[PDB]
Amino acid sequence: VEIAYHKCDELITLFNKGELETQPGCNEEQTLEAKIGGLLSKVREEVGDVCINELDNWNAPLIMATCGSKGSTLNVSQMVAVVGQQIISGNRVPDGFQDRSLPHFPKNSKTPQSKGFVRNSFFSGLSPPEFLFHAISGREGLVDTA
Amino acid sequence: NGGGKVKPIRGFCQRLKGKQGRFRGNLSGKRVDFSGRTVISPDPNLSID
Amino acid sequence: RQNRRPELGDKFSSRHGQKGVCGIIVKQEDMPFNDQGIVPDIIMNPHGFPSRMTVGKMIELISGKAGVLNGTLEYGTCFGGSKLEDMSKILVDQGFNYSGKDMLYSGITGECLQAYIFFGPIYYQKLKHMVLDKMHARARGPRAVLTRQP
Amino acid sequence: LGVPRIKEIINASKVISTPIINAVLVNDNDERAARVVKGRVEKTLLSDVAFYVQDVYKDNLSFIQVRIDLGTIDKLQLELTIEDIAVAITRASKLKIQASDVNIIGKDRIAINVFPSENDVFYRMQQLRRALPDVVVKGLPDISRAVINIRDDGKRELLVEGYGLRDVMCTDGVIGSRTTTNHVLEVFSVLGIEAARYSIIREINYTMSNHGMSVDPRHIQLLGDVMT
Amino acid sequence: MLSFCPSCNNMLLITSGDSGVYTLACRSCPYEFPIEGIEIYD
Amino acid sequence: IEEFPLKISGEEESLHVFQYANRPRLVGRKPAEHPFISAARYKPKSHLWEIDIPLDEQAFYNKDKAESEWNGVNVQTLKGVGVENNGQYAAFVKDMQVYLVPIERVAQLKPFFKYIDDANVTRKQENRLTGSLLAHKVADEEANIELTWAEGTFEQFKDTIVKE
Amino acid sequence: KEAAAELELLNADHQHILRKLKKMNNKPERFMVFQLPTRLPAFERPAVGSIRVHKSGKLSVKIGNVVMDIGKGAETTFLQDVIALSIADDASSAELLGRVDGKIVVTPQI
Amino acid sequence: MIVPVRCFSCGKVVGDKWESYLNLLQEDELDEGTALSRLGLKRYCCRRMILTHVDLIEKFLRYNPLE
Amino acid sequence: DEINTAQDKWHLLPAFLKVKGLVKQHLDSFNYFVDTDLKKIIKANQLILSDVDPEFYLKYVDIRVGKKSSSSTKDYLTPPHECRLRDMTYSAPIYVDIEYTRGRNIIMHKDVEIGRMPIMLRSNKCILYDADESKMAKLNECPLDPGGYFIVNGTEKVILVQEQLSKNRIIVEADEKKGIVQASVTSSTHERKSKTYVITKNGKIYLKHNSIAEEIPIAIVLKACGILSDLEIMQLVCGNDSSYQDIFAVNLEESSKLDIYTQQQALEYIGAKVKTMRRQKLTILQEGIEAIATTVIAHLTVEALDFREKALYIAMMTRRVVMAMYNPKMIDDRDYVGNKRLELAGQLISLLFEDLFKKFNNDFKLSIDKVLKKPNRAMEYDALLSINVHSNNITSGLNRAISTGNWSLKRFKMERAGVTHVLSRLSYISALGMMTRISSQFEKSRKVSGPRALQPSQFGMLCTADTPEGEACGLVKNLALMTHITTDDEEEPIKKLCYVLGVEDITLIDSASLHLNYGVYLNGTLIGSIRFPTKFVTQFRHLRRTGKVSEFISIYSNSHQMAVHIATDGGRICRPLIIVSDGQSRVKDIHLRKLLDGELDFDDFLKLGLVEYLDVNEENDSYIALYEKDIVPSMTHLEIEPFTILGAVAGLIPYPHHNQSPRNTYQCAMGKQAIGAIAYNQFKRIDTLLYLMTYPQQPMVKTKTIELIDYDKLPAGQNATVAVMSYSGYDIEDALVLNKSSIDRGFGRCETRRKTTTVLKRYAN
Ligand SMILES: [Zn+2]
Ligand SMILES: [Zn+2]
């Protein structure tokens, strides 16, 4: 997780006081958006790789989800390893407030954990900022069905 | 009359018509006889079918 | 008034989001016991936890078994509550596995269950939707005057 | 790609969101003729061509006088000098303006003299200053925009938002024998019937293999059949 | 041309002038204009 | 940590003060270029002061417009409502000291035209009343006064002097 | 950063009001206008205060009970050119006086 | 309501010890876990009901007929 | 035993909830009603007078409920619980004092009943109010029932907290096509009235107000609004330079092609297009024909006498639409709570009241006419006991409303329904579950997904853990544990105060504003645009947290949009939390020993300047931290505890932070269906369908939220010793498997209670 904080931190910190390589995303500021979305996804899946592989033999989130029936490797990855990027409406959580998501964050924070991201497993518990986020994605799914 | 402004004075074209009305929810959707409704519960030992 | 025995087909909850109905009511002799002699009362399907991905309950079980030993209601709460890692210490000296798992003996056979099992106190609240209300049947009943269909 | 797309394909209405035109390019290039045809059809470049706009009065003289950057025509290769866009103005002017003389002295100049509820010179003057830095210059008027794409690795070719499929089919420098689109109805107005159908079961089967499952072509061919 | 009325402070507009020349008045409060207009905008 | 004195003023026939939309500061060396002629009015309750400045014939004036319908060779027509609200005080610096004065009613000043009243002159021929309209009609009824105009410094030094 | 520049514009005013203030030291007709809080919060009505700029460009303005009452800057009038009038004995009114140049407010600090 | 007369698993009679429990707590102030232990319940499901089970019947006897 | 600065803040939430109660919303608004708004409504209409007999009048003076001036609480009333068995309606009588005109030298008075008011259990006037465990017995009723629910006709019902869109406020919406409607819908007292505004076509934009015929170019109105300088309109609504210059002037054109000078005719263009006055009163066809409408069109927000306020108000509104026409975004959705204001039972029952009481007066007139029509002797006749015969329309009509949920308001001509409920007792949790439930209403049609999802602004001021599926025509939410719904406060004092700080009245203003600072909006109305915004703020906030105008009257700066807002409105959501001055908090950790001693409690920190109530706006402007463990002296406030966010229902779930939220949502949709012990008066009361359990038990792991709702003294459930295993093969999806010889030992046994009412009635024979 820390390898990503400074990687995307490098991308955002040189976008404000300088320019960068903008991928064919037409306009800019979505450049680092696709960057951060891709990077955090690959990191989250990668931690799930070492979650399923180096996990012990003979234990149920494996023997079930690794193979047979209920859940899948992504699911157990969300339990033991990490959860990441609660993603609503296709991207990170938009501003309800001004220049910020929640009252707990400074202004102009583009770092993760500021929009719909979590560094903590369900097992380690959550922080309120990431809990309120995780109380959104699953809900946008619920209405999206209803 | 009344005159407390009773809106659904319509009695006829609609009873024949819409939503769950006559034509669809009633004639094509006929409520049936010889039935039953219950909560479920698994039974492996019982065969299929 | 009437006092309903919790008949087959009655919604129970785990207060944690598990929403289910009892299956076969086994007798006593059946289902595991282990060393104390206790017989697990409700017995619950494992599969529900991973796909629903709720580990809160699965901690609540630990906190429960740890509670009843010290004789103390043990707390838990949103962003807080009793820190799990000490729960172990309370059990391990009193003989129960540092994690909730423990051995059991299948009541049917009577030989050691080939895998460990995980149990403690959990609070299962019983719901409305008692079945004896909700079962329904008809042979030929009354018909509405207008449509003359049931 | 959602189920509401099936809503519109089945429902088969006139207007549709994101009506993509898929059109294969003559050859494989990212340069020139690649961009050229894109310049041959894209919306209107007039404001992007507009440089700045100019109005001055000398006594009775009423001037609408603007200039243009030719280096932009050098950026995006287009076919014009001026008199092309000059006559083009009075062509498209039928929306509002009236046909009359226009002239260049050199290097992109226009000359518009207008004249006769009074202050008509000022009132028409205003609307002229207003809508003129909009109207179509070169392009196909029903097409919003266009993108050159990359196929696999080797091939790279454009797709274009718009309803035409006839003009752009015709438009020079794109092999027309293969051009593909959505919104079956407008296929029915150019190729028609058997083509429209054979498209509808291609696109149904397409979009409904993305969301998952599989329906087999058997059923779909039947849907597109009784629809056709 | 959208400019300002000195004094009267209302508006400006180009008007049809007598003997042509159009002058430039301020409608609905007295003003006139020198013409020889240097008019520049982008 | 020194002291710069100030003291109050009395009533002294009130005060008032215009600010108007017409003529900002000049861009040049001396931004001021003061107004002229006064020739104003007042009425009780609602004040609504007619304010008047003549027009130049060399200004690109167009006597034709003045000779068209409405005669504009007359003075320029400015008026507006006004309001008082407390704490608003003028002041002036007399040597080392400074004298504050109360203000009372402050009015904006908006140019407009009795000329469209002339546009009416040709246009017309060929319970309730609770609100601002109750105030408008009354404002029209009781409207009527000829005020002179003066300039100078008399007591504004001395009344402030004698009252410290 | 916000407050730094903001609170700096205070002293920027102490300069502003300071210069054109002492430029009024003469006796032409020129009027600077203030705003004071109501209720006249000094001490009582027994029957006033004064001004200073303390060292390093402060404002110490006191009224009564040696109350510290300080306000600076202003809203910017500009385009409005403001003229001070007088009612002369009902009819035969309108003696014009001092026009306007400066404007500043005053607020009890906290 | 009243303490049950056996647990829901073991079947050891808990009906008795609830009195002796609470008495043993109030008089002779002593901590819970140690209390129940020398009160004679080692198995924990037998134990919960002593520990658990608020006694309502008091709070239900305010409402009796006679008052 | 030094108390840890980390958790010691815990001791707040009880002391908060201890004095000022859990369910205070429905109480206060009520107790504010009976003690105040009655003395208003009659102060509105205190004189009914016919047209006849020029000497008469009927002058109300005072209103009282249950207190005729004998003792403080009514000397006798009927006990509520016993009132529940008889199908009666719990009631305290109304008392009014009157002045007559009857015969020579009378002008006399009395203390009279006009009818009876269904007050609310555990209000001020209730018998239960302030009675401890003894009266509870003798009154045969529950101690732990939170109350705040009415009781009528013997059934047991609640007025449900009703959300309503922000009223008298600006809103700006864009759309595909359209052209970005702006709207301001203002209401108070008479005439709730909408005013839409929008572009019609192509930079050519118009006021639609159904009171007018069709539309007006906004340049015309703004002229007629009394700013005549024209081109200074552009300098006002547009800005200095930016882009905005052109976009607006295009509009300003078509005013020039027509007419000008509000002095007479520019107003006349409006009244020319207004509809008729409906015969009489047309007399005002004038140039002052429409001068009525220009102060009262829609906006009762300003009105007054000269025009400049409303003028510049409509101006500053016109700015925000052209700002939207520039670029999308940079606008206002209607989602985040600050743009929505819920409202309690307090204003509801009055609005309903002053109607029923109003009809009472209109018709009591017409009944006082019949006597005075036909002369007999010299007509005097008390002309007073006729209130008895002509009453109830106040009472029985009121019961009809409060029970049924049909509110017919003739005065607003606005009808709403489904506004009350049977309070469902299946559990002690459901008792306060129906209680404290936010019913959103309106929502146009369903097809917009906007007024649906859960907005991040909701943090801690509304329960995140339930939005159940009873949606249908509306939405249902719940409050947090710590919310204080701000009431109405006041206006004129905060106005003159704002001046006292040195804001300058709009009349003095440059008429070039937008460049300079921000502007200061009271309730969305422009006042001063003061110099030095931030210092103004810190000054004002400093006053609120200690000296004056407390609770609400929030304030927040703004940047992108240039404004500073002072909002005094009532019916609004606020929440507690601690100020951190410099690095640390204002608590200083010795204050809490000074607290739990009991000589301190809560609502004392306001006067000590420790905690105050923020607002979704204010806190959005502010900066908050979670734990004291992490602070930076950039901060403002820290939440007192994080777990206040989960609702009274949600607080049940142990370790919620380990779940995925839909499970907690289904749980807040379940636990209120857990059968349980109900209340201590359980067996004595007789209800319609009431379950209950034989051997309830405390949930083994509690939560610091449970203990404070007394949930362990009415536990709903069994505590079951439970393996986790696959057994049988009767298991599969969610299906449990129980235990005989256990279930038979008294596990999970239920009872059920039904009532059958049979009314016996005499017949006219
Ligand atoms: Zn003019
Ligand atoms: Zn046991």
Curated annotation (Swiss-Prot), chain A:
Compartments where located: Nucleus
Region named Bridging helix: 128-140
Subunit details: Component of the RNA polymerase III (Pol III) complex consisting of 17 subunits.
Role noted for this protein: DNA-dependent RNA polymerase catalyzes the transcription of DNA into RNA using the four ribonucleoside triphosphates as substrates. Largest and catalytic core component of RNA polymerase III which synthesizes small RNAs, such as 5S rRNA and tRNAs. Forms the polymerase active center together with the second largest subunit. A single-stranded DNA template strand of the promoter is positioned within the central active site cleft of Pol III.
Note: Present with 6020 molecules/cell in log phase SD medium.
Family to which this protein belongs: Belongs to the RNA polymerase beta' chain family.
Name used for this protein in its record: DNA-directed RNA polymerase III subunit RPC1
Organism whose genome encodes this protein: Saccharomyces cerevisiae (strain ATCC 204508 / S288c)
Full protein: residues contained: 731 to 876 of 1460
UniProtKB/Swiss-Prot annotation, chain E:
Zinc fingers, C4-type class: 5-29
Subcellular location: Nucleus, Nucleolus
Chain positions recorded as Zn(2+) 1 binding sites: C5, C8, C26, C29
Domain of life: Eukaryota
Function field: DNA-dependent RNA polymerase catalyzes the transcription of DNA into RNA using the four ribonucleoside triphosphates as substrates. Component of RNA polymerase III which synthesizes small RNAs, such as 5S rRNA and tRNAs. Involved in Pol III transcription reinitiation and RNA cleavage during transcription termination.
Family indicated by similarity: Belongs to the archaeal RpoM/eukaryotic RPA12/RPB9/RPC11 RNA polymerase family.
Subunit-level organization: Component of the RNA polymerase III (Pol III) complex consisting of 17 subunits.
Name under which the protein is recorded: DNA-directed RNA polymerase III subunit RPC10
Organism: Saccharomyces cerevisiae (strain ATCC 204508 / S288c) (Baker's yeast)
Whole-protein residues included: 1 to 42 of 110
Curated annotation (Swiss-Prot), chain G:
Misc note: Present with 998 molecules/cell in log phase SD medium.
Origin superkingdom: Eukaryota
Function: DNA-dependent RNA polymerase catalyzes the transcription of DNA into RNA using the four ribonucleoside triphosphates as substrates. Specific peripheric component of RNA polymerase III which synthesizes small RNAs, such as 5S rRNA and tRNAs. Essential for tRNA synthesis. The RPC53/RPC4-RPC37/RPC5 subcomplex is required for terminator recognition and reinitiation.
Full protein name: DNA-directed RNA polymerase III subunit RPC4
Family: Belongs to the eukaryotic RPC4/POLR3D RNA polymerase subunit family.
Subunit structure: Component of the RNA polymerase III (Pol III) complex consisting of 17 subunits. Interacts with RPC37/RPC5. RPC53/RPC4, RPC37/RPC5 and RPC11/RPC10 probably form a Pol III subcomplex.
Places the protein is found: Nucleus
Swiss-Prot record, chain H:
Glycyl lysine isopeptide (Lys-Gly) (interchain with G-Cter in ubiquitin), cross-linked positions: K59
Any single GO BP term: termination of RNA polymerase I transcription
Domain of life the protein comes from: Eukaryota
Key words of the record: DNA-directed RNA polymerase, Isopeptide bond, Metal-binding, Nucleus, Ribosome biogenesis, Transcription, Ubl conjugation, Zinc
Binding site for Zn(2+): C7, C10, C45, C46
Cellular compartments per GO CC: nucleoplasm; nucleus; RNA polymerase I complex; RNA polymerase II, core complex; RNA polymerase III complex
UniProt-recorded Gene Ontology molecular function terms: DNA binding; DNA-directed RNA polymerase activity; zinc ion binding
Xref: Pfam families: RNA_pol_N
Location within or outside the cell: Nucleus, Nucleolus
InterPro entries with a match to the protein in the record: RNA_pol_su_RPB10, RNA_pol_suN_Zn-BS, RPABC5/Rpb10
tRNA processing listed as a keyword: no
Keyword presence, Nucleus: yes
Task of the protein: DNA-dependent RNA polymerases catalyze the transcription of DNA into RNA using the four ribonucleoside triphosphates as substrates. Common component of RNA polymerases I, II and III which synthesize ribosomal RNA precursors, mRNA precursors and many functional non-coding RNAs, and a small RNAs, such as 5S rRNA and tRNAs, respectively. Pol II is the central component of the basal RNA polymerase II transcription machinery. Pols are composed of mobile elements that move relative to each other. In Pol II, RBP10 is part of the core element with the central large cleft.
Note from the entry: Present with 5300 molecules/cell in log phase SD medium.
Recorded family membership: Belongs to the archaeal Rpo10/eukaryotic RPB10 RNA polymerase subunit family.
Protein name: DNA-directed RNA polymerases I, II, and III subunit RPABC5
Gene name per UniProt: RPB10
